[PDB]
Amino acid sequence: FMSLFRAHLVFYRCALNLNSSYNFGFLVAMTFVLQIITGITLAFRYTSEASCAFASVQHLVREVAAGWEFRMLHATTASFVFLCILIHMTRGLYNWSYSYLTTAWMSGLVLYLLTIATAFLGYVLPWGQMSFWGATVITNLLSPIPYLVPWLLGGYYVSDVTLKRFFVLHFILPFIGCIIIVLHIFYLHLNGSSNPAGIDTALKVAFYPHMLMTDAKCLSYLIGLIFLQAAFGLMELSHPDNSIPVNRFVTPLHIVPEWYFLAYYAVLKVIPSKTGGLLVFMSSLINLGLLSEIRALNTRMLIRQQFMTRNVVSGWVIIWVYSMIFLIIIGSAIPQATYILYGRLATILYLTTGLVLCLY
Amino acid sequence: SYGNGTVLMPIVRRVFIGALVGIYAYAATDVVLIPGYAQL
Amino acid sequence: QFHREIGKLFASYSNKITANSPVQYVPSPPTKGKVRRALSSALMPVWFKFFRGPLDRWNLAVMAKYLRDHGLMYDDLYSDKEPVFARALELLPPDIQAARFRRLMRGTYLNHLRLYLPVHEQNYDPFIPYMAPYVEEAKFQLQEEEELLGYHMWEGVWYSGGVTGFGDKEPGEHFLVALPNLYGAGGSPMQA
Amino acid sequence: SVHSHNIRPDKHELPASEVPLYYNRFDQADHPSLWQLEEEQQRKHLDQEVTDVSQLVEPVSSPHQTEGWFKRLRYWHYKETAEPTFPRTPDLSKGELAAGATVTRTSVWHDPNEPAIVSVSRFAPDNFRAVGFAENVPNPESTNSDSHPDFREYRLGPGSVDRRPFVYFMSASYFFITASMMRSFLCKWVHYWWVSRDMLAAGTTEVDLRPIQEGMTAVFKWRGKPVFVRHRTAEDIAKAQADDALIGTMKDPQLDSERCPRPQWLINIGVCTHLGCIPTDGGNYGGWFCPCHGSHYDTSGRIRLGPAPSNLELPPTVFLDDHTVKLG
Amino acid sequence: YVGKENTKGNVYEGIPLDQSILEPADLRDYVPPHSNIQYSKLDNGLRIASMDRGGLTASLGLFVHAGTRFEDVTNFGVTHMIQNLAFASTAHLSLLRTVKTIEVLGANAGCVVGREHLVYSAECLRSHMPLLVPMLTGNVLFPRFLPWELKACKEKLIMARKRLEHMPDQMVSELLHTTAWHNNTLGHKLHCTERSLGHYNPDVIRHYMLQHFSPENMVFVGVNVNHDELCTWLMRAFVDYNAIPPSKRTVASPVYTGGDVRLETPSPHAHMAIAFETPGGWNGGDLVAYSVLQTILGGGGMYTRLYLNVLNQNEWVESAMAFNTQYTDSGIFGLYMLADPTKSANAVKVMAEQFGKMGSVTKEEL
Amino acid sequence: SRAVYAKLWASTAQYTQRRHYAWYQIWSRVIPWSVPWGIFAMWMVFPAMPVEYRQALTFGIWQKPNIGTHGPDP
Ligand SMILES: CCCCCCCCCCCCCCCCCC(=O)OC[C@H](COP(=O)([O-])OCC(O)COP(=O)([O-])OC[C@@H](COC(=O)CCCCCCCCCCCCCCCCC)OC(=O)CCCCCCCCCCCCCCCCC)OC(=O)CCCCCCCCCCCCCCCCC
Ligand SMILES: CCCCCCCCCCCCCCCCCC(=O)OC[C@H](COP(=O)([O-])OCC(O)COP(=O)([O-])OC[C@@H](COC(=O)CCCCCCCCCCCCCCCCC)OC(=O)CCCCCCCCCCCCCCCCC)OC(=O)CCCCCCCCCCCCCCCCC
Ligand SMILES: CCCCCCCCCCCCCCCCCC(=O)OC[C@H](COP(=O)([O-])OCC(O)COP(=O)([O-])OC[C@@H](COC(=O)CCCCCCCCCCCCCCCCC)OC(=O)CCCCCCCCCCCCCCCCC)OC(=O)CCCCCCCCCCCCCCCCC
Ligand SMILES: CCCCCCCCCCCCCCCCCC(=O)OC[C@H](COP(=O)([O-])OCC(O)COP(=O)([O-])OC[C@@H](COC(=O)CCCCCCCCCCCCCCCCC)OC(=O)CCCCCCCCCCCCCCCCC)OC(=O)CCCCCCCCCCCCCCCCC
Ligand SMILES: CCCCCCCCCCCCCCCCCC(=O)OC[C@H](COP(=O)([O-])OCC[N+](C)(C)C)OC(=O)CCCCCCCCCCCCCCCCC
Ligand SMILES: CCCCCCCCCCCCCCCCCC(=O)OC[C@H](COP(=O)([O-])OCC[N+](C)(C)C)OC(=O)CCCCCCCCCCCCCCCCC
Ligand code: HEM
Ligand code: HEM
Ligand SMILES: O=C1C(O)=C([C@H]2CC[C@H](c3ccc(Cl)cc3)CC2)C(=O)c2ccccc21
Ligand code: FES
Numbered sequence A: 001f002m003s004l005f006r007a008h009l010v011f012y013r014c015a016l017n018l019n020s021s022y023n024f025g026f027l028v029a030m031t032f033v034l035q036i037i038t039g040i041t042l043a044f045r046y047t048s049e050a051s052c053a054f055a056s057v058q059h060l061v062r063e064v065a066a067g068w069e070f071r072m073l074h075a076t077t078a079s080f081v082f083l084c085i086l087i088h089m090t091r092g093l094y095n096w097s098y099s100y101l102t103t104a105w106m107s108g109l110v111l112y113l114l115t116i117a118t119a120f121l122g123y124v125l126p127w128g129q130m131s132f133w134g135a136t137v138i139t140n141l142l143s144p145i146p147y148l149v150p151w152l153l154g155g156y157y158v159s160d161v162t163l164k165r166f167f168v169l170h171f172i173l174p175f176i177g178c179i180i181i182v183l184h185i186f187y188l189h190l191n192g193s194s195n196p197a198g199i200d201t202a203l204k205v206a207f208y209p210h211m212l213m214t215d216a217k218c219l220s221y222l223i224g225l226i227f228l229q230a231a232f233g234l235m236e237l238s239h240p241d242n243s244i245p246v247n248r249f250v251t252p253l254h255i256v257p258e259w260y261f262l263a264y265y266a267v268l269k270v271i272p273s274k275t276g277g278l279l280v281f282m283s284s285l286i287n288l289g290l291l292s293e294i295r296a297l298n299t300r301m302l303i304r305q306q307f308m309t310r311n312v313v314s315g316w317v318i319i320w321v322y323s324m325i326f327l328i329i330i331g332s333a334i335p336q337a338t339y340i341l342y343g344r345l346a347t348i349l350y351l352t353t354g355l356v357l358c359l360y
Numbered sequence B: 001s002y003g004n005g006t007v008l009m010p011i012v013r014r015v016f017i018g019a020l021v022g023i024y025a026y027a028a029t030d031v032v033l034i035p036g037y038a039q040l
Numbered sequence C: 001q002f003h004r005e006i007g008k009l010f011a012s013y014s015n016k017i018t019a020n021s022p023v024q025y026v027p028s029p030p031t032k033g034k035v036r037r038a039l040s041s042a043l044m045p046v047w048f049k050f051f052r053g054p055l056d057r058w059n060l061a062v063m064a065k066y067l068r069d070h071g072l073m074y075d076d077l078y079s080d081k082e083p084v085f086a087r088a089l090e091l092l093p094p095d096i097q098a099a100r101f102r103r104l105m106r107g108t109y110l111n112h113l114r115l116y117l118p119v120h121e122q123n124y125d126p127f128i129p130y131m132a133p134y135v136e137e138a139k140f141q142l143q144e145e146e147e148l149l150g151y152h153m154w155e156g157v158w159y160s161g162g163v164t165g166f167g168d169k170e171p172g173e174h175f176l177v178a179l180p181n182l183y184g185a186g187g188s189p190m191q192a
Numbered sequence D: 001s002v003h004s005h006n007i008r009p010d011k012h013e014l015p016a017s018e019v020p021l022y023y024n025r026f027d028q029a030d031h032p033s034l035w036q037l038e039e040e041q042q043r044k045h046l047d048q049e050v051t052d053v054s055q056l057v058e059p060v061s062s063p064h065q066t067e068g069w070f071k072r073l074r075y076w077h078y079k080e081t082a083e084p085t086f087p088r089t090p091d092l093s094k095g096e097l098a099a100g101a102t103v104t105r106t107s108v109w110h111d112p113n114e115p116a117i118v119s120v121s122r123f124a125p126d127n128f129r130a131v132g133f134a135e136n137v138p139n140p141e142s143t144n145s146d147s148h149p150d151f152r153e154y155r156l157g158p159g160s161v162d163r164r165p166f167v168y169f170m171s172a173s174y175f176f177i178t179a180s181m182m183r184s185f186l187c188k189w190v191h192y193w194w195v196s197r198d199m200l201a202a203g204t205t206e207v208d209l210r211p212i213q214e215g216m217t218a219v220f221k222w223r224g225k226p227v228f229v230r231h232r233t234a235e236d237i238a239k240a241q242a243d244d245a246l247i248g249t250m251k252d253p254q255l256d257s258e259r260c261p262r263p264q265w266l267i268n269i270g271v272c273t274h275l276g277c278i279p280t281d282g283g284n285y286g287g288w289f290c291p292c293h294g295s296h297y298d299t300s301g302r303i304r305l306g307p308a309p310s311n312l313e314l315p316p317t318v319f320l321d322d323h324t325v326k327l328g
Numbered sequence E: 001y002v003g004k005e006n007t008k009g010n011v012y013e014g015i016p017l018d019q020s021i022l023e024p025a026d027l028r029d030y031v032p033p034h035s036n037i038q039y040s041k042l043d044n045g046l047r048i049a050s051m052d053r054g055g056l057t058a059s060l061g062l063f064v065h066a067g068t069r070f071e072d073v074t075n076f077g078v079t080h081m082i083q084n085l086a087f088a089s090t091a092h093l094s095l096l097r098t099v100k101t102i103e104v105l106g107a108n109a110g111c112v113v114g115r116e117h118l119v120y121s122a123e124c125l126r127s128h129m130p131l132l133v134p135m136l137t138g139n140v141l142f143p144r145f146l147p148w149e150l151k152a153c154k155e156k157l158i159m160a161r162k163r164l165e166h167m168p169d170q171m172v173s174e175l176l177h178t179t180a181w182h183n184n185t186l187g188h189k190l191h192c193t194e195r196s197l198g199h200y201n202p203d204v205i206r207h208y209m210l211q212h213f214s215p216e217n218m219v220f221v222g223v224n225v226n227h228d229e230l231c232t233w234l235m236r237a238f239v240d241y242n243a244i245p246p247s248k249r250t251v252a253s254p255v256y257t258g259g260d261v262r263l264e265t266p267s268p269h270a271h272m273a274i275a276f277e278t279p280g281g282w283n284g285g286d287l288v289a290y291s292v293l294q295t296i297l298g299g300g301g302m303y304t305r306l307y308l309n310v311l312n313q314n315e316w317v318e319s320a321m322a323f324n325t326q327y328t329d330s331g332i333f334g335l336y337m338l339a340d341p342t343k344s345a346n347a348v349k350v351m352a353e354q355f356g357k358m359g360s361v362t363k364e365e366l
Numbered sequence F: 001s002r003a004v005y006a007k008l009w010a011s012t013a014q015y016t017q018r019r020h021y022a023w024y025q026i027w028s029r030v031i032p033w034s035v036p037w038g039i040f041a042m043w044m045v046f047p048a049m050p051v052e053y054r055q056a057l058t059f060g061i062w063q064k065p066n067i068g069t070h071g072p073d074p
Helices: A002-009 A024-043 A053-063 A067-095 A102-124 A129-141 A148-153 A160-191 A207-232 A259-270 A274-296 A316-332 A337-358 B009-039 C002-019 C034-070 C083-090 C094-113 C132-149 D032-039 D116-123 D164-191 D234-249 E078-084 E095-105 E126-141 E147-152 E156-166 E168-180 E202-209 E227-238 E287-297 E305-311 E341-356 F002-010 F015-048 F051-057
Strands: A013-015 A204-206 D026-028 D128-130 D205-208 D217-222 D225-231 D265-269 D303-305 D317-321 D324-327 E038-041 E047-051 E057-064 E108-113 E118-125 E218-223 E270-279 E317-326 E330-339
Touching: A002 A207, A013 A207, A024 A067, A024 A160, A024 A207, A053 A067, A067 A102, A067 A207, A067 A259, A067 A316, A102 A129, A102 A160, A102 A274, A129 A148, A129 A274, A204 A207, A259 A274, A259 A316, A259 A337, A274 A337, A274 B009, A316 A337, C002 F015, C034 C094, C083 C132, C132 E095, D164 F015, D205 D217, E038 E227, E047 E227, E057 E126, E078 E108, E078 E118, E078 E156, E078 E202, E095 E126, E118 E126, E126 E218, E126 E227, E126 F002, E156 E168, E168 E270, E168 E330, E218 E227, E270 E317, E270 E341, E287 E305, E287 E317, E287 E330, E305 E317, E305 E341, E317 E341, E330 E341, F015 F051
Parallel strands: E047 E218
Antiparallel strands: A013 A204, D026 D128, D205 D324, D217 D225, D225 D265, D317 D324, E038 E047, E057 E118, E057 E218, E108 E118, E270 E330, E317 E330
16 A cells, blocks of 8 residues: 555656645645544543533533643634635636546535535534524424434434434544545546646646645644634634523524534525525535536537636636625524525525536 | 446436426426416 | 337338438528527627627637737647547647647746746737647547447446446546556556 | 575474485486386286275384474474585485485585586486385376266256256245345334334323413423413404405415414414424514524414415314313 | 338248248249350440359459559559558548448458459449449549558558468468569569568558559459449449549569579478479460469379379378469469478489479370 | 448438437336336335325235234223
């Protein structure tokens, strides 16, 4: 397995002009490994009982040596997982990477779905108000089929049984992640990476000396920033309301998911029909999947240059990003008619600019 | 094409295009037309 | 006899299509129905002056400047991961091929440095079609193979020879045929 | 391969020029071709008849060879302890073996009467063969002994039935038992995720209504969900009834009198029909407002605005007395 | 075959093969065809000859007067290149389509080089003749000679001789030719040497063809086809296009050198051959004398001169033979033998006696 | 001749129709696999259905197993 190590991470030859925007994959992998370490060492002291989970998490912070550090590293590294993934996705929307990296793009989408599931399962385990009512909402959202929801819950309502199986599932999924990562990289190195210029070039250079050092530099920056936020708390990434014990008969008066879930939340606020809600997610994900075979949707021969530099027309990916940010903004606010109106405007933009990527 | 091993992505292409046509039809019926017929 | 009956359906339809065949070139029917042709023809004076005109001019300005900064031509944007263009590149003569290689090298280096070229290096037309005679030949050659070999879904032996058996001809290009060896030094397909 | 040899000097095991463990008598030929002749001139023990185990020829080599504590096996042949610089000279008069080292580092091959190049030619390892070789070494003609049965007594010949049906029936039988068992396993595993036998969700309750005041909303617990009981004011009633004229416009039309069999008493399940949140006091229609996505309900329970698809659900209930109600 | 129109299936299912299925409608009263050769000519120069014997399969062939004896120091190997390019891309068909169509019609087709002729031919049912005449004439009317086909076809130029290394008899044939006419005309080799792969560029091929492939140097021959249809479909082939214009070429007489040559290899016999020249060749009047004498001696029977006077009187010869090869204007005639390699000096003596007494014959043998 | 070359060129004009025929053939070979897998789907999902639907779908052959417990109460 050493010979493979050398073939793929030492003698592998890249293009000279790979700048930082091509370093974020490595970064998400590293946040995965790190999150796994802190996960396992958190599991050694966590209690999976509805009667006492909350106090179990508080015991780590209050009465255990370095107890606070692992919880906070685990909490904060999640945000960086998602931030790095979104940068990593947008880079390849910008470049039209999926033109020839077909199966890599598919694998990517599967990994993103895995990550969403993993995060949301994690989000229930500390067992506060937000955890209980979030679980209630998302389980009610997948109700269309009889008996599936009491079965997956384990029970007529969110329960200790639900906590136990969420804990086991959150244990298992990351490692399935890892396996799919190996699959991802297989498809990638089958083809070879693209340039920022989107041309084919013979001016290649080996990995170990030049690109490995850039990977290391960015890694230093990321470790830095994680520790900064973890130790000092600069930003209010997580809302305070998960600090309150659960009550099964009273909701919290103000509700804000974790930031990486706000856009979705915005949709659930503005579309009238609940099924329309769910279908928007399904449709957008199907549209992203459809990009894998964009070469077939037209008989003009395709190029990777999108000529977005100096261009007054901008590009659909940029409009997508700004629409998504606008949806995050509206996600965060209270339900009111005007917020809903601009919500619907932004939602139409978000859907249309995704549909239109296929129309070259 | 002849002499190529990719055989399962074309099927997924057709299924996806199908499914989007489906979803948009149903969404037009659900979110717009049925209410519209209450306003007509 | 179900199969022969559906055969009959297919055969009659094909004979209809055959009977209508011309014996010489006939111009294609328009791409748009008469309604949309009418509407476009009506709205032309406003739409072309205010919107389409400037859009199509800005586009060429953007493209030209980006190509001139780097010293590329337009036909340097196509890849060889595209079968037709791969054939076209196989059919090229020495000089054109060498010049393309050189331009791609220079473009890579310049995009690495992110430095403009002097304006006196940018005095050329980037949109010359230097690949066309070869792309058309490639299209012909690759169309005839589909006609004469690809007209059916052929049946094969599965997972033998390093190929899945559903059509591939290069070993280990798919995941279920990864890792061909467990001992030894391996090998390469090009040295068989 | 991954396996070493163990050629080394050893003080427990003397070299084979010193102490051979095999029986050290060998015949020698001037040219190995001559070994052909002996194969067609000797007698052989396997060409002759014996009937009892006691008649089998006795081994030439002695039982008494290897000694030492806890050594089960008492007989061996070959060892790889290393030779010295000056080996022990073989005595060819006793038919001892001369091979490798003992040819190179010894005078054994020397003859007064003969050129050296001729003399050395007789000491290749093909020129030596043990005593008893032609008489005892077997050379089979087949793997099958004529005293055992081969396919000839088991072959199904002319006149036989066809057995494909039987073979494939055998294997189909195996498989359908297998599949039944597999399905049973999956069914049990699925069932194991289902709700436990202690829960049962059964029960009923009753409520006393004397302490309630006009305009107040009381909340109670029923089958795992909250239930609202409200003593409506005359103006609440009027608000509900004024919107009966606009029933045309509603997403889930219903008239107030059905929802309040006693007009001044309003009863509902306290849960949002959208995704399960619990509506709060207020909203635009003096009823209830859900904070999770913004649905509004009127003073009768009806959905007036927002994403929720139906009115607040009526629980199965009865007024037991003027001042007491039954749930379930 | 997009579906099929006929649904009746196997209409003779279950009928044994010793039970007839012919109806009286399918009986006929036999009329023979007429089978003397018919001779015609197109206006551009092409000569046509035809016969019919009422067989169901036809034989079609185009003959061109372009052998290897017409090459020179700048041309050596060009004829082999042309033959190795037969049924390649032409003006209106590609190589792939051509060969695939010939396969699917069911036919067998090919091209052959000699020292004086080049031949193309095909064969299948006679009802397909109109579809085969184009594909045969194409090769001489308008080939394209695209570079990437020449380059891909090169290895077949070397395999042609690599296989001769395990065909001793043919090998000796070639040795005889190159020794008899050293370095001229019939002497030239039938293959591309290493020195012959330089001038493998389209201009040399094309310039060579412009000197030989004109219509008046050609013949088209057909067997089992109706002559007026053959004439019609041949005329319809040359009517639109300009053929290669005529040329008043001249041919030099072969110079016979003779000589001697040896080539050793582990074969377990001494193979030997001796030969003399036939003055005038096929155009000499004595074409029948040599062909009778070859049968007196013994061709490639058991009452022949060699069989009686050599093979039955010596233990150490495996085979003795007389050979006779003729060309338009010269030939050779001689003897060939395989012997025990320890007795070659006796083999020469036997051959010398035999040559000694060919001059005289008795009427029984004659 | 122009006529023959035209016929040869036109021989493959209907490529798409032949490909549709191929679709038909392969799907005809493939689609019967739906019966085994359909039976197994139904096998697994039968005990999830209401008792009445189990009784109905088996035309009254299926009934609650009798194991000697939970009998009527006088
Ligand atoms: C809430 C609202 C929103 C809802 C969501 C809406 C989402 C909509 C958007 C959808 C996005 C895309 C989804 C995937 C589409 C895939 C299309 C496809 O077929 O692509 C062909 C395409 C190649 O086609 P081709 O180019 O024609 O090549 C021809 C070759 O002959 C082909 O051979 P090859 O060797 O070249 O290719 C590899 C081959 C062979 O690959 C392998 O052998 C790899 C095996 C790895 C196993 C590792 C364990 C994985 C366990 C499942 C994890 C699921 C996580 C899901 C995330 C949410 C979690 C809550 O795999 C395939 O060909 C693909 C098979 C189908 C994959 C389906 C993946 C999704 C469903 C999987 C779970 C099913 C549910 C039950 C289990 C759930 C358990 C949690 O393949 C890909 O691109 C696949 C990339 C890898 C992604 C999948 C990785 C997982 C593989 C799972 C295999 C099935 C077993 C599952 C476990 C069962 C036991 C527990
Ligand atoms: C790990 C695997 C295990 C090892 C063994 C391998 C297992 C595979 C066996 C299944 C395949 C049976 C079908 C045989 C077809 C033979 C045809 C032929 O002559 O071959 C040449 C032909 C290709 O030659 P070509 O036509 O020159 O190529 C041009 C292109 O095909 C482009 O052609 P085009 O663009 O002109 O369009 C043509 C297209 C035109 O048609 C369409 O495009 C129709 C689109 C309509 C949309 C509806 C969806 C269509 C797909 C149906 C899927 C249903 C199957 C699943 C049922 C589940 C039951 C529980 O034609 C078709 O779609 C006809 C074939 C469709 C068959 C697909 C389903 C076959 C499965 C049957 C057994 C099902 C039991 C599964 C049990 C559960 C586990 C999976 O072969 C194919 O096209 C292959 C079709 C079959 C798919 C590949 C098999 C998968 C191999 C990778 C394994 C992935 C496993 C992942 C799990 C990993 C676990 C960890
Ligand atoms: C404060 C209190 C203090 C109290 C102090 C008390 C001290 C008492 C000490 C007693 C020491 C006894 C041993 C004396 C050894 C003398 C050696 C000697 O003179 O060597 C000269 C001389 C040495 O020269 P050499 O060159 O080595 O030649 C010898 C050969 O090498 C030999 O090789 P070879 O090839 O010629 O012969 C074949 C070879 C190879 O033979 C085989 O491989 C054959 C194997 C056949 C096995 C078949 C088994 C089948 C049945 C299995 C049943 C299942 C059982 C398992 C399941 C059961 C359930 C659990 O045979 C052997 O290896 C024989 C092995 C005999 C083992 C005897 C072990 C006695 C242990 C006594 C207890 C000691 C303390 C225990 C530990 C205490 C806690 C640390 O050797 C000889 O001449 C031969 C002498 C052999 C003597 C053996 C018999 C000794 C009998 C002693 C009786 C003692 C009675 C004590 C009563 C105490 C009452 C209180
Ligand atoms: C006899 C001589 C000997 C011959 C020897 C020959 C050799 C072969 C042997 C043959 C001898 C007998 C052997 C006995 C075999 C059978 C026993 C057996 O197999 O039991 C198994 C047994 C299973 O027991 P079980 O599951 O408790 O059984 C419960 C029953 O199944 C009860 O379950 P259920 O009642 O819930 O089942 C439900 C069932 C219920 O079934 C029924 O009730 C069907 C009734 C059948 C009636 C029969 C009809 C035929 C007879 C008619 C008579 C004809 C008369 C004419 C002839 C006579 C007069 C001429 O319904 C269905 O299945 C679904 C219905 C059909 C679906 C298809 C949809 C059709 C729709 C209909 C459309 C029509 C319209 C309807 C709509 C209505 C409106 C119009 O094994 C076990 O208990 C488990 C063993 C543990 C082993 C675990 C396996 C290993 C796991 C480890 C894996 C982990 C390691 C990793 C993997 C390792 C991999 C290597
Ligand atoms: C891909 C995942 C599959 C999971 C399998 C579970 C499916 C559900 C439960 C079983 C359903 C019944 C079986 C399927 C039907 C039979 C298949 C079929 O068509 O037959 C093909 C064939 C049937 O062959 P046949 O010769 O009997 O008949 C076919 C020929 N005709 C059609 C002419 C009759 O099966 C085989 O040849 C299989 C060879 C192996 C047989 C022995 C297997 C025993 C188990 C060995 C060890 C297991 C441990 C390894 C597993 C790892 C995990 C622990
Ligand atoms: C491609 C298919 C993949 C299939 C993967 C699915 C595997 C996991 C299956 C889980 C099923 C859970 C069902 C939820 C309902 C509650 C179950 C339960 O225990 O109920 C109590 C019941 C008993 O009821 P009870 O006695 O507890 O009381 C309730 C009474 N009833 C049920 C009437 C309301 O227990 C069971 O019977 C066990 C459930 C068996 C159902 C198994 C379903 C398997 C699904 C696979 C079918 C796949 C077909 C292909 C589809 C593909 C389409 C593209
Ligand atoms: C990509 C990998 C992972 C991600 C993205 C992830 C995500 C999360 C998130 C967002 C939380 C919420 C923490 C909080 O709200 O304070 C969490 C908690 C938790 N995770 Fe994970 N996790 C990952 C891997 C793992 C692994 C591999 C394990 C164990 C093997 C694990 C065990 C836990 C535990 C025990 C908690 C509870 C923390 C607490 O109660 O304070 N995690 N995880
Ligand atoms: C755990 C999640 C992921 C990991 C660990 C990961 C890892 C990597 C790595 C290491 C690379 C090569 C170096 C680099 O580009 O940084 C890469 C490239 C790539 N990834 Fe990911 N990735 C993940 C998620 C995704 C997602 C969600 C997508 C798409 C939606 C995706 C699509 C791609 C593409 C297209 C490339 C190559 C782009 C090009 O070559 O031009 N990946 N990935
Ligand atoms: O009302 C909500 C709500 O709508 C969600 C939502 C956010 C989006 C989630 C989500 C949507 C789509 C995907 Cl693919 C993944 C997660 C589902 C839960 C919450 O997270 C929540 C948490 C606590 C209290 C109330 C609520
Ligand atoms: S859960 Fe009440 S409005 Fe959505």
